[PDB]
Amino acid sequence: SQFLVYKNIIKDYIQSRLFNEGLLDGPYRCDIKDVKTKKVSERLKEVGNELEGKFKDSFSNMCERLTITDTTAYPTFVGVVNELFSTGINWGRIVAFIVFSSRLAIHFKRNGMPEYVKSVYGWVARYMHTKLSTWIEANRSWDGFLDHFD
């Protein structure tokens, strides 16, 4: 059920971020029943918000620099994220990956690609499931994430 855990984490992250941005169609509500997954999500929102704020200007204009269209959106996502992890995986980089993905979703909502927001959830879940899963489990999974940011 690992792809779905990742999908629910990124969905929660992005829904909360869109809500705060005034872009969420309807109310924010967390649907995560697993107490531990909820704790993971809450911490990820906290550290992602902190990372984004520390580099607000960079994250704000990132998607504009990429000249995103419907046809280049996924290839650009894969290209950016592959480059990010090509010189290593760590938890800070995973957070930056999540923040970038949320900025993509904001870009999509604001620049007339709102239907692609739900695609981000699947893109991130698939990326985590295929390319980061081995690393994540080798680094004690979400307990290692929570330890790292304590």
Binding site: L51, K54, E83, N90, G92, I94, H148
Partner: peptide, 24 residues
Amino acid sequence: SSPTSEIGRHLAQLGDSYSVRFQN
């Protein structure tokens, strides 16, 4: 040299930089 590679490399440094605090 691509904007894709430029932005990915940038994100890597942002994540590395962000991590320092938490081992300090």
